[PDB]
Amino acid sequence: ALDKW
């Protein structure tokens, strides 16, 4: 999963 930013 990619970080929020």
Partner: antibody, heavy 123, light 108 residues
Framework: RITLKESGPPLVKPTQTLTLTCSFS??????????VGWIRQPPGKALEWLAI???????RYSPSLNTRLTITKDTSKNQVVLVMTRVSPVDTATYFC???????????????WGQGITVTISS | ALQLTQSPSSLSASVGDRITITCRAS??????LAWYRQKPGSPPQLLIY???SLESGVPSRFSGSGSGTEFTLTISTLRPEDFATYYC?????????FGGGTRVDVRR
């Protein structure tokens, strides 16, 4: 400015649940993109990422501890709570909560940390 | 899982020395890497964010560089208060991994 402080039981029994609270001031979990994460450190070991919660209740947990952790936030009290179940002696460590800046680059770090609370797991 | 490898894990130096320390990531993390200094008994303290940005209030001797999978933290001239443990952290992928740390002690 921003400050955070971890509180909870310094002593916890093997098998029992650990509940920790992060109380903060100087900022608020309402303000967009802001996050409050938890990081632990076993005596003499390296830092270990536990979880993080954001302004929009968005949430993430460390995969390995996912079925044992629950993180929540109460905007009325500026507190973030971490609940860790079925703890064992290996969970003995210093638990820190930290602040993560929101989109103003500066989001790439945990800029302010609590003093940390020492938790010992023994029967 | 994404692994962050710090090298060297332990390093001895003297006041006035120039040292450079590295953090390697198993996968590209763009510029999402932070460096922290941790003195014993105290919590980690942010030095560099976004891989190369010097955090406000942090002394000029500290600097960072890198992108993708390779990153470094350099201390132009270490001071007595720099004998501590340093950690890097990537915030590109969840979970937000920390490296194993680099211990800097006094050489004799």
């Amino acid at each position: 400015r921003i400050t955070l402080k971890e509180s909870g039981p310094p002593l916890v029994k093997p098998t029992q649940t650990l509940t920790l609270t992060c109380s903060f001031s100087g900022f608020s979990l309402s303000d967009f993109g802001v996050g409050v994460g938890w990081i632990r450190q076993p005596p003499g070991k390296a830092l270990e990422w536990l979880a993080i919660i954001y302004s929009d209740d968005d949430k993430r947990y460390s995969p390995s501890l996912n079925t044992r952790l629950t993180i929540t936030k109460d905007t009325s009290k500026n507190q973030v709570v971490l609940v860790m179940t079925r703890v064992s002696p290996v969970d003995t460590a210093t638990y820190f909560c930290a602040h993560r800046r929101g989109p103003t680059g500066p989001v790439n770090a945990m800029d302010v940390w609590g003093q940390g609370i020492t938790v010992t797991i023994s029967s | 899982a994404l692994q962050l490898t710090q090298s060297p894990s332990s390093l001895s130096a003297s006041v006035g020395d120039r040292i450079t320390i590295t953090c390697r990531a198993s996968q590209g993390v763009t510029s999402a890497l932070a460096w922290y200094r941790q003195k014993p008994g105290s919590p980690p303290q942010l030095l560099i964010y976004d891989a190369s940005s010097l955090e406000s209030g942090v002394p000029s001797r500290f600097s960072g560089s890198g992108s993708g999978t390779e990153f470094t933290l350099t201390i132009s001239t270490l001071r007595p208060e720099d004998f501590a443990t340093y950690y890097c952290q990537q915030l590109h992928f969840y979970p937000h991994t920390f490296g194993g740390g680099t211990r800097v002690d006094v050489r004799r």
